[PDB]
Design a protein around this ligand. Structure first.
Ligand code: CLF
Ligand SMILES: [Mg+2]
Ligand SMILES: [Mg+2]
Ligand SMILES: [S]
Ligand SMILES: [Zn+2]
Lengths: 461, 464, 111
């Protein structure tokens, strides 16, 4: 049934966001409202649309200035917070750029301040020739025309290319809108503006993977073994110009259908490129994905050789962790997709029972997926808030929580260990090896002498 | 010796030194017991700052958002503030203080915060006749100043709000102390100094319990210890000791003007002389003697520093960045131990104030070498100077400058906020005598490790 | 539980193609994948002439392999039964992923 938690008695509208799956229910009658307005004052986990554009997608790129048109906080706040390495010395994590909006810009306009900052950034780093410009709350409100400014800079600097995103933080209800605006703007403005050499008979884009702790680079070992050219990664370990070439691919393989389904859907509509949805977390899921990719291309036997090798290398260690993790109870409090990518894979491959899940920004589609794959007796929460987390803990008594570090630090006080479900503990976590890494961190989290010591009161005889 | 101030020569920023004003107002508020700040603006303005605090302290702190969305961005956000206040009060029965912190968005759209507070006060008095909730308007447009100024603004507004409500009463016999933006370990040290001097004081804000235990009973103790009652009592103090010109002195000034509590601004107590002078001023205002225990702690610090200064520190060139009180004070500490702080970077638009700081002349009269002070600086300004050939032996700053030091292969000591890339620094004092000692030993140990990794006379670490 | 119950429970717990972003894409996938499954399970050649057909084949092959592994009956069953079963399965997936889904985005023309 839907659940009215005690801490929500004065915000009873939350009932329609929380589902406790019970036997025999028709789940179509119990789908949480999702992607609706946030209730003020709740300590919702949500962030802003600008986050979804710059921090999550655009900022992953290795060779691109991330020009945040706004006051300095939006830039500060999106720097030193992500774990998406590159193979060029992590340019993307080392720098952030602001137009340092001041009061005079609010009153008289910020377009010249932006133009000047763009030139400056290109002058300071003459080897960097690509940029994304993002709006933020106040530059949206005053109506600065960042596309126009970008077009002028491009005319003055024929060596560069600039993309613009209108994504103030108050757009939409969460970071989701930033995903949407960036995807649609990129396909409308930048896809099909360049081409690259095709060097394989098998080509794909890999859509919706952001190289957290090297996930993309690990998956690339598979594509290189299989002889498949990745035209573009959207956007893990990616380049700006690879994304301009996405129309060239034969296949779009999608992992994050929430952040990046938009562009896959438009690439299919405009170019006929089929969309293949996979799970690139999970051991048995990773095999299924490789088998589907190989079936599409007609290289089934290559895929079986790869899978057999990876099972022989990593399945015994996975099974060691399974023996020890069987029956443990897990909660997943993250953005959305990792709920449906992980609930059944940790159950199948590790014997772990996911007892509670919360999605910051997921849509109804994400809830369809997670409820389909998830267990009876589990709580499914849209746009969870802090006091709810405490009540859910009391209800389900998880052995481990996969969530962000700040929530991890909170639930430590209750003697519940965490694994960073966003940026990982010791990743990567995608692929065959990555699920072993996940399992290891789960095991170390729970099998931890400190938890037992913390429960001892030394004054008790 | 010439100490030259210059501004950043670029309009834009690359690698900002500070966050925006609202972030600092949130930091001020989280140090109050039974306080949940409410940040009126888009959601990122809250959630990114909660993350920042988790990076520095490895703890959660409660801050709420009004969740400005598109409707409210066009048609006004007063109902988001008002709903957020009520949702807080309804769900947190022990909540007493809500600083209502503006952002760039709600400053641009002109929401009338004071009017929303009148509305909320009426609503709250009707709904909760037995409670009193203090709502403080905190005007922190992010397109001015920085988190330094926002912290100062928030402290001042919360003190104005609470002391307006309570006024002046019985003299307390206590000092008010505004240490500024410091770590829990700095507050621990100050509390020890007042205790050893037999001086009653409130430290505003008392953040000691930000370093909270993991306890057998699973209780959560990660809270500010400064109460409403503590704040109200500031009107009754003997005197205010303000340690930080840019981080609370304006509150000491407001209490002087409003309540005739004399404010004494002193140099922020980094290094020996500044700590001496702080303790002298405490003795003067209280009539209490400095105790032998502090002469001993001082002496232990000097003994430790004397093992390092001429041997390892002399003639070594240092760049320092961080909050202005910390930069200026650390530069003074560095000269006591023969380091040469040749580049000081201060990160915001307050240069007209910094040019008048008396410490600038103090640095001019004690420097054996030219100093450049870059104001309105970003951290690219440091990186670009090193790229152009500035030769540094040490960087002292916060963790968001780490890649500059890593890539240039320069040892770096983590100071100020945030220091997320080392463990435990929030517990270690940097001010006072113990703190001078601890800073100096961090510097030496960072140089020592660097000598080992680079094979630079690593054999010399035997009989120093 | 019926053979069709077993198929339905497998698709719901394992597959993603019935949960694409819009009604039209769900319809296209339910038809396309399950027509390929029916070819595979009755020993007919799959369609592989167009990229889309080759994708349907990829998704169907996983399903067909998994159902043959999971369900004894799925080897040791008819042809006319695959037909009956897949017609039923199409109707059931359309009902739960389209007709009676409360996902409010499903008919948004704009992606
Ligand atoms: S919801 Fe998102 S992070 Fe917030 S402002 Fe808006 S785009 Fe940005 Fe920016 S400078 Fe500071 S942090 Fe805000 S008050 Fe403005
Ligand atoms: Mg000694
Ligand atoms: Mg089922
Ligand atoms: S979000
Ligand atoms: Zn053991």
């Amino acid at each position: 049934p839907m659940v009215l938690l005690e801490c929500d008695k004065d915000i009873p509208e939350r009932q329609k966001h929380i589902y406790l799956k019970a036997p025999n229910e028709d789940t179509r009658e119990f789908l949480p409202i999702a992607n609706a307005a946030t209730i003020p004052g709740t300590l919702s986990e949500r962030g802003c649309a600008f986050c979804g554009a710059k921090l999550v997608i655009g900022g992953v790129l290795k060779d691109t200035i991330q020009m945040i048109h706004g006051p300095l906080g939006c830039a500060y706040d999106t720097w030193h917070t992500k774990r998406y390495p590159t193979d060029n010395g992590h340019f993307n994590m080392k720098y952030v750029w602001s137009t340092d909006m001041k009061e005079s810009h609010v009153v008289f306009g910020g377009e010249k301040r932006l133009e000047k900052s763009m030139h400056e950034a290109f002058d300071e780093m003459p080897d960097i020739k690509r940029m994304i410009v993002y709006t933020t709350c106040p530059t949206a409100l005053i109506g600065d025309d960042i596309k126009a400014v970008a077009k002028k800079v491009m005319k003055d600097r024929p060596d560069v290319d600039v993309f613009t995103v209108e994504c103030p933080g108050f757009s939409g209800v969460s970071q989701s809108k930033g995903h949407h605006v960036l995807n649609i703007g990129w396909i409308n403005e930048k896809v099909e503006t360049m081409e690259k050499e095709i060097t394989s008979e098998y080509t794909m884009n890999f859509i919706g993977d952001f190289n957290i702790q090297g996930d993309t680079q690990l998956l690339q070992t598979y594509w290189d073994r299989l002889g498949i050219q990745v035209v573009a990664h959207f956007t893990g370990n990616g380049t700006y110009d690879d994304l301009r070439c996405m129309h060239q691919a034969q296949l779009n393989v999608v992992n994050c259908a929430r952040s990046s389904g938009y562009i896959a859907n438009e690439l299919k509509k405009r170019y006929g490129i089929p969309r293949l949805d996979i799970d690139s977390w999970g051991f048995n899921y990773m095999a299924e994905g490789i088998r589907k990719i190989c079936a599409f291309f007609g290289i089934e036997e290559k895929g079986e050789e790869l899978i057999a090798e990876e099972y022989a290398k990593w399945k015994p260690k996975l099974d060691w962790y399974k023996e020890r993790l069987q029956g443990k109870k897990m909660a997943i409090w993250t953005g959305g997709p990792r709920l449906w990518h992980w609930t059944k894979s940790v159950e199948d491959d590790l014997g772990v029972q996911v007892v509670a899940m919360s999605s910051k920004f997921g849509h109804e589609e994400d809830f369809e997926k997670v409820i389909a794959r998830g267990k009876e007796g589990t709580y499914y929460i849209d746009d969870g808030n802090e006091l709810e987390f405490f009540e859910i803990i009391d209800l389900v008594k998880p052995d481990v929580i996969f969530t962000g570090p700040r929530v991890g630090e909170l639930v430590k006080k209750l003697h519940i260990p965490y694994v960073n479900g966003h940026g990982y503990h010791n990743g990567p976590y995608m692929g065959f090896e990555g699920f072993v890494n996940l399992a290891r961190d789960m095991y170390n989290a729970v099998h931890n002498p400190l938890r037992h010591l913390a429960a001892v009161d030394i004054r008790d005889k | 010796a010439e100490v030259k101030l210059s501004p950043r020569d670029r309009e834009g920023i690359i690698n900002p030194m500070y966050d925006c004003q609202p972030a600092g107002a949130q930091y001020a508020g989280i140090g109050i017991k039974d306080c949940i700040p409410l940040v009126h603006g888009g959601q990122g303005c809250t959630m990114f700052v909660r993350l920042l605090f988790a990076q520095h302290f490895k703890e959660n702190f409660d801050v709420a958002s009004t969740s400005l969305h598109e409707e409210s961005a066009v048609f006004g956000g007063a109902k988001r503030v008002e709903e957020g206040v009520l949702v807080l009060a309804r769900r947190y029965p022990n909540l007493r203080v809500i600083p209502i912190i503006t952002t760039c968005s709600t400053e641009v759209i002109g929401d009338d915060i004071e009017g929303s507070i009148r509305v909320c006060n009426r609503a709250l008095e009707a709904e909760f006749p037995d409670r009193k909730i203090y709502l403080a308007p905190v005007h922190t447009p992010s397109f001015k100043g920085s988190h330094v100024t926002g912290y100062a603004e928030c402290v001042k507004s919360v003190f104005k709000t609470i002391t307006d409500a309570h006024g002046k009463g019985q003299p307390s016999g206590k000092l008010n102390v505004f240490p500024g933006w410091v770590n829990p370990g700095d507050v621990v040290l100050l509390k020890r100094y007042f205790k050893e001097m037999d001086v009653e004081a409130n430290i505003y804000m008392d953040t000691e319990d930000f370093d909270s235990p993991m306890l057998p009973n699973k209780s959560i103790e990660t809270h500010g210890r400064t109460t409403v009652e503590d704040i109200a009592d500031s009107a009754n103090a003997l005197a205010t000791l303000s340690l930080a010109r840019y981080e609370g002195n304006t509150t000491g000034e407001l209490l002087q003007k409003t309540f005739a509590v004399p404010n004494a601004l002193v140099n922020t107590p980094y290094g020996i002389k500044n700590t001496d002078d702080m303790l002298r001023k405490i003795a003067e205002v209280t009539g209490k003697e400095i105790p032998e225990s502090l002469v001993r702690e001082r002496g232990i610090a000097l003994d430790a520093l004397a093992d390092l200064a001429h041997m390892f520190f002399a003639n070594k060139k240092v760049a320092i960045f961080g909050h202005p009180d910390l930069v200026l004070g650390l530069a003074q500490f560095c000269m006591e131990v023969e380091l040469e702080p040749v580049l000081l970077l201060i990160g915001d638009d307050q240069g007209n104030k910094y040019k008048k700081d008396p410490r600038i002349e103090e640095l001019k009269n004690t420097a054996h070498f030219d100093i450049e002070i870059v104001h309105n600086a970003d951290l690219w300004e440091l990186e670009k100077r090193i790229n152009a050939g500035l030769q540094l032996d040490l960087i002292m700053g916060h963790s968001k400058g780490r890649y500059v030091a890593i890539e240039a292969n320069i040892p770096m000591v983590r100071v100020g906020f945030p220091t997320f890339d080392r463990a435990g620094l929030y517990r270690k004092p940097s001010i006072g005598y113990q703190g001078a000692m601890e800073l100096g030993e961090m510097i030496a140990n960072a140089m020592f490790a660097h000598m080992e990794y680079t094979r630079n006379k690593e054999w010399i670490l035997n009989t120093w | 539980q019926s053979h069709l119950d077993d198929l339905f429970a497998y698709v719901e717990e394992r597959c993603l193609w019935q949960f694409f972003s819009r009604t039209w894409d769900r319809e296209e996938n339910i038809e396309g994948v399950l027509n390929q499954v029916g070819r595979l399970l009755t020993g007919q050649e799959p369609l592989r002439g167009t990229p889309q057909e080759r994708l349907f084949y990829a998704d169907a092959l996983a399903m067909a392999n998994d159902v043959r592994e999971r369900f004894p009956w799925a080897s040791q069953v008819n042809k006319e039964e695959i037909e009956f079963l897949l017609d039923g399965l199409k109707s059931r997936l359309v009902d739960v992923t389209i007709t009676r889904s409360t996902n409010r985005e499903l008919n948004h023309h704009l992606y």
